[PDB]
Design a protein around this ligand. Structure first.
Ligand code: CL
Length: 226
């Protein structure tokens, strides 16, 4: 399998994001590696412009589902590795309940030996001291299922899901995610039957890191097909 074969071992990852939320600009760089055999990602992000102006957890879904573990019986449903090495475009609208939204566009593709995710994010209509701009989210993350369906007219997939962000008082901020992936190349890809990715993510800090940053550990496995 062409794109499959790219993921058999440990693959270096680079992530670059440029953001503007309510007119506040920022950049983040990240790096680490992914091992699709285990569905495992390990990543470290740095805000290179100073302090991140939105909470770190609100960016986790934005910051590579090609590293998901597709069990053997589900391998024909793996759109993400089938689009490689040329890659795919991943767009989202992320609507924070009773608050603003992010729109993101990313390119995920091999650039030489490294899998690269380059993102542009634009956030509008946030409240000046709502959970996002007021930094009221706990520094943590919950497990979620990403329900994938084929988008055959775009030769890709759509996904819909809701992220639960725990709030420092015990309430939860929902972030509705509407996602569209289109391959960058012209040829055929694998278009899946309905299924889901089981995502889990754990956020931590590097004690020796004085920059605003996030260390992110993920495990992602496909499921929903027996
Ligand atoms: Cl939860």
């Amino acid at each position: 399998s062409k794109g499959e074969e790219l993921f058999t071992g440990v693959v270096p990852i680079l992530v670059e994001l440029d953001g503007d939320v309510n007119g506040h600009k920022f950049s983040v760089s990240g790096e680490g590696e992914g091992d699709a055999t285990y569905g495992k990602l390990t990543l470290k992000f740095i805000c290179t412009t100073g302090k991140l102006p939105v909470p770190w957890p609100t960016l986790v879904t934005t910051f590579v589902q090609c590293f998901s573990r597709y069990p053997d019986h589900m391998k024909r449903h793996d759109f993400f590795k089938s689009a490689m090495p040329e890659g795919y475009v991943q767009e989202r609208t992320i609507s924070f309940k009773d608050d603003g939204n992010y729109k993101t566009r990313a390119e995920v593709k091999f650039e030489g030996d490294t899998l690269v995710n380059r993102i542009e994010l634009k956030g509008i209509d946030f409240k000046e001291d709502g959970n996002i701009l007021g930094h009221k989210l706990e520094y943590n993350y919950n497990s979620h299922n990403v329900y994938i369906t084929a988008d055959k007219q775009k030769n890709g997939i759509k996904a819909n899901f809701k992220i639960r962000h725990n709030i420092e008082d015990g309430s939860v901020q929902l972030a509705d995610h509407y996602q569209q992936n289109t391959p960058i190349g012209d040829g055929p890809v694998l278009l899946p039957d309905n299924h889901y990715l089981s995502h889990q993510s754990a956020l931590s800090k590097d004690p020796n890191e004085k920059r605003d940053h996030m260390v992110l550990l993920e495990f992602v496995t496909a499921a929903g097909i027996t």
